[PDB]
Structures are given as C-alpha cells and as structure tokens.
Amino acid sequence: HMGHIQIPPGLTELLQGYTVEVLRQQPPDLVDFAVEYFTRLREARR
Amino acid sequence: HMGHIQIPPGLTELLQGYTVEVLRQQPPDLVDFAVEYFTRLREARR
C-alpha cells in the first residue's frame, strides 16, 4: 500500500454546519466564533 | 442587488486555508486542530 491519497469523510458535513450557523446567527467575529463552535463540538459528538 | 444582504466574501478563503493545512498536517484530531488553529489565528494578526 504505497502511492495513493486518503480523504477522511466528515469534513464535508462539519464545514456545512459552520457555514450554516455563521450565515444564520451572524456572529460579530467568525474567528473567535470558529473557536467557540468547534471547541463545543467536542462535547456534542459521543 | 435587490434584497439586502447576500453571501459575504472572505469565508471561502478562510475555509480553503483550513482544508489545506488539515490535509497536509493530517492531524489525528480535526476538532482539536480547528480549535487550536482558529484560536491561534486571533493571536497572529494581533
């Protein structure tokens, strides 16, 4: 097994969720917001 | 034109920048990487 690419699934949905709330809640800062969202995602899953 | 607000630009570049390093650094945790990357961003621009 050598000479191939591996794209892990899950980045298409995780990004779609952020693109949603951002264009819906319209936060004052996307940077700081991106930290509050993903950081909270840790508790969401599992 | 008509309406009021539309898809704001600037989010496409911020995402492409992440999708890049994420595929290169291939970290074992994208959630922890997104929180460590964005959080460090605010400290970069200063």
Partner: peptide
C-alpha cells in the same frame, strides 16, 4: 439559496489545493 452556495464551496476548495497547489 444558501445550501447551494456552501455545497459547491467545498468542491472548489478541494480542487484548488491538491492540484499541485495551483
């Protein structure tokens, strides 16, 4: 719409990166 702009949004991001970073 909005879901249509984000959908292809991820497609253009993947291409402009692995294509020799072009």
């Amino acid at each position: 719409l909005l879901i249509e702009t984000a959908s292809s949004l991820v497609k253009n991001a993947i291409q402009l990166s692995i294509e020799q970073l072009v």
